[PDB]
């Protein structure tokens, strides 16, 4: 276990964040729950220059 696991729940996930193609979630609610934290990462390229 390492790639197959909900970033929010903490058990298992079958969906993947099409935005960064890195996040995983089992339900629309799961992605929103961690969204607050995940969104800081999602999109790649940290907000620094311009």
């Amino acid at each position: 276990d390492s790639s197959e696991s909900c970033w929010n729940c903490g058990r298992k996930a079958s969906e993947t964040c099409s935005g960064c193609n890195t996040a995983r979630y089992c339900g629309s609610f799961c992605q929103h729950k961690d969204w607050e934290k995940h969104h800081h990462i999602c999109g790649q390229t940290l907000q620094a220059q311009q």
């Binding site: 079958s14 969906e15 964040c17 099409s18 629309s28 929103h32 995940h38």
Partner: peptide
């Protein structure tokens, strides 16, 4: 209270 994140992609083989 946050924007709307991109859509989710379900994978399965």
């Amino acid at each position: 209270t946050i924007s709307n994140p991109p859509p989710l992609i379900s994978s399965a083989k």
